[PDB]
Amino acid sequence: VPESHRKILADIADEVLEKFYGCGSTLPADGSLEGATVLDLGCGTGRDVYLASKLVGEHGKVIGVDMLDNQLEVARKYVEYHAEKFFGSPSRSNVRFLKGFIENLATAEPEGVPDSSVDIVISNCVCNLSTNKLALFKEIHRVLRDGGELYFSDVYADRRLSEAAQQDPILYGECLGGALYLEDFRRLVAEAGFRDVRLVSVGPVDVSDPQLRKLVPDVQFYSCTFRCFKVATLEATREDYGQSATYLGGIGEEFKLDRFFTFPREKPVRVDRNTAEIIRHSRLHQWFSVSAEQQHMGLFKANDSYALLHAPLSMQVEQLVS
């Protein structure tokens, strides 16, 4: 738990913390959250929705979605509580909780999530129990506005699991059985409309039970945090148009977009055009200066890890854990 969140969680209702299902949804840098609309898929009792509530401030909004009756009941009891806590009045809530399958946000209750209405979709470990990943990714793409991002953590595999592993109920409940191979994930999310997957962080996930490991003997599992922007002008490849981006300051000493691009305050950093377009069309533009496109210069190589930048996801992930 990041320090900047600790004081806010101390202010969140003990019943929300005590009954919360799962691990916290990871968030983009606090400063970038100001005024955003955030949607948490599988919000549980609302721990992350309330944390985001504060971080987005009074001009932001947070929406939580879940299908667990008891979780939501708890969530919905503390709306006034946290409005008082954060904003000073019980009537000043910027959160709402909706009941529904994450696969179809359009028909949640009391209301659905409309097209192009969300800046950030967050979630932690929801995909491998999803009933239909493609449909889930398509629904995320639908609700995001242009320049919005899916910023999420989940478990992935370095190879395709066997049928036997995919049928095992303990592997399934542990979010391993339903894990995609990293390249299959890349193709699936691209079919849903996310043409550029950026690796934020990765940790190893171990299967130590020797019985279960026999179903996935040499499989390496990872918990990966990815950010996938919805930006109309993204291409499948990372092309150089001679651009630089300069982080202007104001949401930290430096801005780390992903494991390839770190932007120190007031220093120009060469960027491929996808990265430029992400900065320009997303909410991040507020804190950046991005130079004009020149003539195409070929594949983007002005990065000290440009080889890995263009490589398959499995190589990026495997090398970042090293």
Residues that bind Ca ion (CB under 5 A): 22, 42, 44, 158, 220
The count of residues in the chain is: 322
SS3 222: strand
The annotation status of 253 as a binding-site residue, yes or no, is: no
Choosing from 16, 175, 180, 197, the residue that interacts with ligand [As] (CB under 6 A) is 175
The annotation status of 196 as a binding-site residue, yes or no, is: no
Rounded to whole angstroms, the Cα distance separating 85 from 53 reads: 11
Choosing from 125, 190, 297, 302, the residue that interacts with ligand [As] (CB under 6 A) is 125
Burial category of 187 from C-beta neighbours within 10 Å (exposed 0-12, middle 13-18, buried 19 and up): exposed
223 interface partner picked from ligand [As], Ca ion, Cl ion, none, CB below 5 to 8 A per type? none
Residue 205 touching Cl ion (CB under 5 A): no
Indicate the residue among 94 and 153 with the shorter CB distance to ligand [As]. Answer: 153
Residue 125 touching Cl ion (CB under 5 A): yes
31 interface partner picked from Ca ion, ligand [As], Cl ion, none, CB below 5 to 8 A per type? none
Name the minimum Å distance from CB 272 to Ca ion: 27
Rounded to whole angstroms, the Cα distance separating 250 from 288 reads: 10
Phi, psi of 63 (to 5 degrees): -120, 130
Residue 197 touching ligand [As] (CB under 6 A): no
H helix intervals, the chain? 3-10, 14-19, 47-56, 69-77, 79-87, 133-143, 163-167, 169-173, 182-191, 210-213, 273-281, 306-309, 313-321
The annotation status of 220 as a binding-site residue, yes or no, is: yes
What residues line the site for ligand [As] (CB under 6 A)? 125, 175
Binding residues for Ca(2+), as ranges, are: 42, 158, 220, 318
